[PDB]
Symmetry: none
Subunit: 179 residues, 6 copies
Amino acid sequence: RLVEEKRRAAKLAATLVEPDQTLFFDCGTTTPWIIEAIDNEIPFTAVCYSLNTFLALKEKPHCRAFLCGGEFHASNAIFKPIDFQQTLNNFCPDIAFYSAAGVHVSKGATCFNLEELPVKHWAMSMAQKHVLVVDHSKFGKVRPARMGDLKRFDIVVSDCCPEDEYVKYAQTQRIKLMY
Amino acid sequence: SRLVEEKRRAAKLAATLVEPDQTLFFDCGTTTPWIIEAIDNEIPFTAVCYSLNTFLALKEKPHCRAFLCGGEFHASNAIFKPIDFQQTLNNFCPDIAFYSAAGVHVSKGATCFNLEELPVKHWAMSMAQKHVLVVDHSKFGKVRPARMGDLKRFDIVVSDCCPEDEYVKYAQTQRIKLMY
Amino acid sequence: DQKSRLVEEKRRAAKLAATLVEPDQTLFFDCGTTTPWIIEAIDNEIPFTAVCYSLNTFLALKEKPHCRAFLCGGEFHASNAIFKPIDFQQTLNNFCPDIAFYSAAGVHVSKGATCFNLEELPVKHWAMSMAQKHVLVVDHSKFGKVRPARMGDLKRFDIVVSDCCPEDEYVKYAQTQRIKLMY
Amino acid sequence: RLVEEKRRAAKLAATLVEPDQTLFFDCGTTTPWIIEAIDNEIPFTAVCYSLNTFLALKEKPHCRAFLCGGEFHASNAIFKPIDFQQTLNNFCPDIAFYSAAGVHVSKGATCFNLEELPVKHWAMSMAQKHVLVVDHSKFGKVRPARMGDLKRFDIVVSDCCPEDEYVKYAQTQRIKLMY
Amino acid sequence: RLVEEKRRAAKLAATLVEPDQTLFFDCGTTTPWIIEAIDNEIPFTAVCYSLNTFLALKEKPHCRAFLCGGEFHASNAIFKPIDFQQTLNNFCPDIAFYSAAGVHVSKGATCFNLEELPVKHWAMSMAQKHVLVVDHSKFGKVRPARMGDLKRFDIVVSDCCPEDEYVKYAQTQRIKLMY
Amino acid sequence: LVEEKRRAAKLAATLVEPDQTLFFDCGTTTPWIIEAIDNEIPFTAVCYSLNTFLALKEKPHCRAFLCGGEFHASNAIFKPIDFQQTLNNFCPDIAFYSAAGVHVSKGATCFNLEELPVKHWAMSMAQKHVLVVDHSKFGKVRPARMGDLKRFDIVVSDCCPEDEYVKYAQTQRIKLMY
Ligand SMILES: [Cl-]
Ligand SMILES: [Cl-]
Ligand SMILES: [Cl-]
Ligand SMILES: [Cl-]
């Protein structure tokens, strides 16, 4: 589970949040720790597509919360839109916080489920700043559903310094590493 | 909190209308979750809703394919209000829509407390194939500020006991089936 | 002059009518120069929702910091600066107001409540059919007058608010029809 | 502010108005200049959803003015219909004049408030010709409420030629630029 | 199952095909009769998303057959794209031929399966002319998956003149009825 | 060489684990791999040819994906026009490849160049690369070059190839299964 590592990376990712921003939060067990770490006095607007992520936003007294609806999928408790992403097409989030099961220089960022790709792809195209929040265990892993190339992300946040391969790759692509 | 026993009986009767593989719409409130709980746990069905407690009840049904209408979250009745285009809901023509109402009045119609619930209630009233209002005996004669529509918009009104003769006569004249 | 005395009579009736507003109620305000004084007299700390169909009524609601204001749109008409709804399903059919506050140019025991403009009857009749409590707010000069547009029988109003008690025939009619007179 | 630039762009947009047309005017401080530029002898029907826009139409002696009613929102003094589906039924404007706080090739046209999206989306679905009227400062900006892709607009009107990025996108997508 | 009626409506729909057009064919047992009715000498490009439709196109010597890929669903043997936003982004068919289980004046065109809506919605958004081909039994029926309002279709083709309420709706909405 | 192809295909099928995401190349060898997978093993598969898809369609526990595009009669394949629609969404656990030639110098080759865009996609995105060829493919040189043999982690055949291939496989750390 690496809960302690996820919580530390998420706390560092939360330092990027500014008052009145519109934020996108991906699914999984890492992003809810970002929501918890945001000071409860900071007002913000948030969009999400998973039950545990929404329930975390619901506990923030100054969060204007939006949920992308659709068919419920038990894995990661997500909602998958039938086709058009009406709710999401109304936003250009200041920051999108992403989750991934794998981070690979050649293969890119991957996840376990294809059902999560439509919303992750929407965020990658419509958000203004892309922040991948992943514990150290995700580096070097490759899962079967592909989100995209690592160059799609502006910042990668983790619990400790990634291997030298990712440090050098991040320098070349101007990807900021926070750990 | 109050009239749970009555809400349970109305829900029990409403659940008998469900048939296998139907697409069902469930309104917000504390009555409709009891309908979902009363449905045969072995019957497969597809359900559409727009509120958190309604969705959580559908999630507990092993053979329910559940859809949630998204949008802005409103604390009252824990609903989701679409910004404008009802994308998820525009994909459905439910076999049965189960509605909630704070008031049932012969001339003013069915009413609720919150205007934010009217867009999805009006959608169901235009797109569902059968309209079933599920209300306890206390809703009859009450009028709240947000108007859902005329009682002739419903095919069936389900309650825990027979309403006053005023509603029996009205339902008989309008061809509205009363179930209690 | 006669203009200033008319405003203070309307303001006195409107100030008394404002005492009926309770927190979180949904209110309807009619058109004219009496209803804006009701809106102004409501405690600025009381939250409420209000629907109207005229520009001056809307502008008065806009000044209330805790008023959730709704304006019935449509085509604009110069007299009383009203909006004629094309479709009542747009805004008005969504409401069953807790209280409807009405204006009238005439109040008569047999001819009923009347106004000058037939164009205002569609919205006035809508409110009379859908609101939960009906409050007619009129200065004393309106009693006994009969204008061409008929709103309805005086018995359709739960409360009639004026700047002074009307003549005995109105007091007796109110007792027979269970109309509360406020003055 | 840029009042002179807004007036010059709006004056150019007004040249598209023909007698007896039905026009939609968006909210903001640019569209009132289009209304001012229309010849006073030209009769037309107009629909709007904001107080300042309506007051400008009321001042036009040969304008049959319609106001889209609903809940009042102080920002831009707009009215938001209770039910988007019942917005201005049976109105099919010949031209819709739109406002935007941001014009971006990838993110599209954006505005500051989500409460303005329902009537803007109504016009985008019902109007026969879509004209975006924006001063040069809107180009490159991305605001939190998204109206739609720039290809949703038939014409983009401005006070001067925008950067080559926009001239190129308009040329490839066949979007007319007027300046 | 009115196969002769489906074949008659399909033959009439086939008269709209012109050489070198790009055509979309919906799933079901009505559209394959349109494909059979097209002269085997007429060259054309076909887009489909179902196995039986594809196998019918594969036999047309001058047809360039394109298959919309994705996840296979046994009902109607269709393919559902992983991400609707990336579906056939380069095609703008001259004509889209649609299927429907229900044709209703108020509720619109409906089908039985939600998995068919993404490609049906893609065609409705990208094709230049929309032609619904339905036998007389579809009129008045309502199924649970909604494709859209009847006004989304330019032409409705059937095996006989439908009931007066459909003739009136079509006249008012400018929908051409072919039978 | 149906018996030889089934022999090699059956050996290749022993590599499949439940719940894996697999890529199956075109040709008449890969459908025999699909046939050999136990019908009770659940798996997800992506392909780009008609016969390969029809083979997946017969597996009751296979979640089947077909990469679309323009149909091409030879090897009955689909030529993708947009890699973003289906293929770029996958990083398969195992890619099972076909080839008409296996040569130390010329590498793995096929007859049709229309197959290279999808084969090259698989070679770059799959996690494990398994070339399944009967003994007759060794030493042949066809006109469409897939890539050097070192790009494949495993080469599955129906019998031991000539010593030149055994030694080359050892120097490249390629596993030979036969
Ligand atoms: Cl009057
Ligand atoms: Cl709102
Ligand atoms: Cl595809
Ligand atoms: Cl190399």
